[PDB]
Design a protein around this nucleic acid. Structure first.
Lengths: 119, 175
RNA sequence: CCCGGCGAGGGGAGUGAAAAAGAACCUGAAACCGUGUACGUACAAGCAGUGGGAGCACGCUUAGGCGUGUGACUGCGUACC
RNA sequence: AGGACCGAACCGACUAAUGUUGAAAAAUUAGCGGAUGACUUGUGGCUGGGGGUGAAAGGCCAAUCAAACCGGGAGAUAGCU
RNA sequence: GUGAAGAGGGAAACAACCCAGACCGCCAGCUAAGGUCCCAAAGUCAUGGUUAAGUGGGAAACGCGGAAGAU
RNA sequence: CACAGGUGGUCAGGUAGAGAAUACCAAGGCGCUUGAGAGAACUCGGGUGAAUCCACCCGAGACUCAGUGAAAUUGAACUCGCUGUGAAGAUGCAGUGUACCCGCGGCAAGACGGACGGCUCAUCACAUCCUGGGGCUGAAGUAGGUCCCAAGGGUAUGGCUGUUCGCCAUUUAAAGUGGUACGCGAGCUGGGUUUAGAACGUCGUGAGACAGUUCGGUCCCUAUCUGCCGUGGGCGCUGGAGAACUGAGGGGGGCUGCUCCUAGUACGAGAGGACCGGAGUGGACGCAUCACUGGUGUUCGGGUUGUCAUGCCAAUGGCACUGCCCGGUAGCUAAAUGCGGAAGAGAUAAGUGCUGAAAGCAUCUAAGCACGAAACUUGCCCCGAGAUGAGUUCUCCCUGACCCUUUAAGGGUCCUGAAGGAACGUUGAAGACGACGACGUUGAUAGGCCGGGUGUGUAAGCGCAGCGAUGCGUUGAGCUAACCGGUACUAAUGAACCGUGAGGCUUAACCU
């Protein structure tokens, strides 16, 4: 503990944290833009980027894994058809964080979106 | 006599011909070049300042850049001092290799303990206070192998601190 | 009329002798909370006051040494029923 | 048929902890005990203060009992702060 | 006799120890106990003596010793 | 109090279920009154934008827990230690020493915090006891009494007496003796008294009390400063600033069993029998590490019982302690060890000594004049110039102008804004909060990706066999958070604030 540790404390149940991560990832892949605190945005990016990278390759196993980790038929249907080819030539950095001004001393807020988000 | 400064990279085990496992620590010892010489007449005592590593010119402060340019040497990551044993005197810009420890077989290692949170009385003494960010000196340690071309030094047992820390190796005063 | 949020509240103009009378509304001190004016305090030990005591701004006899606030230091100093 | 056994609701505070201006002027949590019998409970009424009640702790009688509250004796009281 | 009902000065401190009974004010001088190296105001004053252990600056009986005292 | 506590009856479904119990579901109700903010009027310096009328945001002063806000207490506090006196341990009296001002996290030498009694491992003496190791006592054994690093502050029966109790008897692992208010009645309790009800009677004008009666019974509060440890904001070391060290002072530990030969040598008639501490070998404790020897590792894989869902299977996700187990990445620990407590030196009590008397002897000393015990200090590991006596060394920067006065450690205005720091982001092996290391386009600081490593175990699909289960090649496959070397794919942009503009007075030496 306190040495070479990844991930904030995030005091809560592990299952609740996983459900929250899945919900935020689904929201991001659906709307391609979210407003949330910097730690939450970073956690969402960390949890979603592996899914996007896996979705780059179209296969039955990849689709099944995405469905298992997302539990949304519509979301997986959207994936492997648009996001894949859109970011096929890009390795990493599929999401960007923009500072939307302010709390400053209570909790920061920022927008998390895709590299393009359109076109 | 004089000690060098190295960087910890890792620790592993070494097997001898007879088949004995001895813990060793990976320490990279860059050639320390003397930057300043302090004498009795001016500074009041005999000493030599040693610099190791390198830093980007952007982050190097102008006073430090001027001090390094005075000695005509590249700017390093820090400065260290060692007290001479009334022996031969070095000169500014004289690079020092790791050959000195190649014929001593006994060295002492000084490092910085890794930081840790507040510890209870039982944890510390078995008085509460700050743990880590403190000196750690280990003596009576014998160098296992010395590699001049690789600048790699091995010492029996472990050494203080974690990977990437800076340690100081000095001749074993006790004898 | 303006700021304010199309509220509350505040600032102007007017009425009002007076708004240093605005519905918390005659006269308006203290304990308590902030700002400004002048001074002491980051090498200095105890009922925190008493005399001496260099200065710091101002008004005085328009200097000639007085008073409006402070004492760095120094002799003395174990509150009341 | 069990003052029978295990085991829900339910009942007892028997034990430990939570607090002693508390969440409550005696309550809460975790175990323990009974769980067809001397069981419990919804509602209605009776037993009244030198008294009633009390499987006798002189327990309880409106969060108080070795004799409760209100107004009068009483602006009471020997001694005392 | 003091305090009880008296201030002040000295004994380093202190209520019973010594001098000393404050009407008030004045940047004056002289005494008592106590001091005159400093702290702290005053002779590092003068003469005749004991003292080598800091006894002074804490001690009984007893043959200089006796003599061991409190973070 | 919209309280967390209490309130009597009826409606009583599905699955695995003997069950109205257990776990999830049908219709229905909820995600809880602390977890989380805007730009906060106004004021300053700025850059950006069509050339008066200005518009956008940053770096700041001005709110901050998105906050109302109570709590016993409080004569005034500028609230240090030691020694002596004191109605008796003096933060306040006399003498002496130390300490920069104001905060934060822990430990209580103790504040006589505040409103009798013993149950007391942390600093103390007797064997102290919230359950480590011991040494002695011609101890018959167990056991007492004597001693160490030490304070089980929850507990026996009893004489002197009042009981746990102040002296002690039997004591076992203690039933226990005071320092600190016997550390707390800011813990408990009465177990006998003055005090929960009886209780012989008392000293006592009375108050006040009877450590005297036989049984005794219900005792309250949310760290105020202070001492120690660590860590912060301001200021000063005299122009400012960044680094590296000397050093006045201060911090804690010097434990202990065996053997090899040295040497069965010396000494010693014989018996007897070392100095040798020359080298290795154990245990208690301290620093540090995870490659090795065990755990955790609710973030990783696999197996499995019930239940809801993906329209059904295969296969998955949610719940049942992480639903229950096999493990286990990095990290954190000990159940594992590299080192440590040196060697040596100074002065030492006792003791051992070169020449040597006074007083033709003697003798450790009178003259010349030397060693030495686990005692003391260096030597071993250190911090430390707030040491105001404020140190030493190296380096970087400012080289302007004008006006006025009460004409000097003077004041004011325009411009300049150096080195350095802070402001914000990535962040860490730094972290309660501060603070500290590295980077910010002149880049691997963080995220992801590439290949590898560890872990887990034969993922799904396909065709065959078994008329079920299930197996075969696909396949040492799939997945892998924290590990390794690169990748700018993404985020740290151009920037802006403080901080200056030649540095006071006196004196000695150099050309004027």
């Amino acid at each position: 503990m306190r040495h070479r540790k990844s991930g904030r404390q995030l005091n809560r149940n592990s299952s609740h944290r996983q459900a929250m991560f899945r919900n935020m990832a689904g929201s991001l892949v659906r709307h391609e833009i979210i407003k949330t605190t910097l730690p939450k945005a970073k956690e969402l990016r960390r949890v979603v980027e592996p899914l996007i990278t896996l979705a780059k390759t179209d296969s039955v196993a990849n689709r099944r894994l995405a469905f298992a980790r997302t539990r949304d038929n519509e979301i997986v249907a959207k994936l492997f058809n648009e996001l894949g080819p859109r970011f096929a030539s890009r390795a990493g950095g599929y999401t960007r964080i923009l500072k939307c001004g302010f709390a400053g001393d209570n909790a920061p807020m920022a927008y998390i979106e895709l590299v393009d988000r359109s076109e | 006599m004089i000690g060098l400064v190295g960087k910890k990279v890792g620790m592993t085990r070494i097997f001898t011909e007879d088949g004995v496992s001895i813990p060793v620590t990976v320490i990279e010892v860059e050639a320390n070049r003397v930057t300043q010489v302090k004498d009795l007449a001016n500074d009041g005592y005999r000493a030599i300042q040693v610099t190791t590593g390198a830093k980007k010119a952007n982050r190097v402060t102008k006073p430090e850049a001027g001090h390094f340019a005075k000695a005509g040497v590249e700017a390093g990551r820090g400065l260290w001092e060692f007290r001479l044993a009334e022996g031969e005197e070095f000169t500014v810009g004289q690079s020092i290799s790791v050959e000195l420890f190649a014929d001593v077989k006994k060295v002492d290692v000084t490092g910085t303990s890794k930081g840790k949170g507040f510890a209870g009385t039982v944890k510390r003494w078995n008085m509460a206070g700050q743990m880590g960010n403190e000196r750690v000196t280990v003596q009576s340690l014998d160098v296992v192998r010395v590699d001049a071309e690789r600048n790699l030094l091995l010492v029996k047992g472990a050494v203080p601190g974690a990977t990437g820390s800076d340690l100081i190796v000095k001749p074993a005063v006790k004898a």
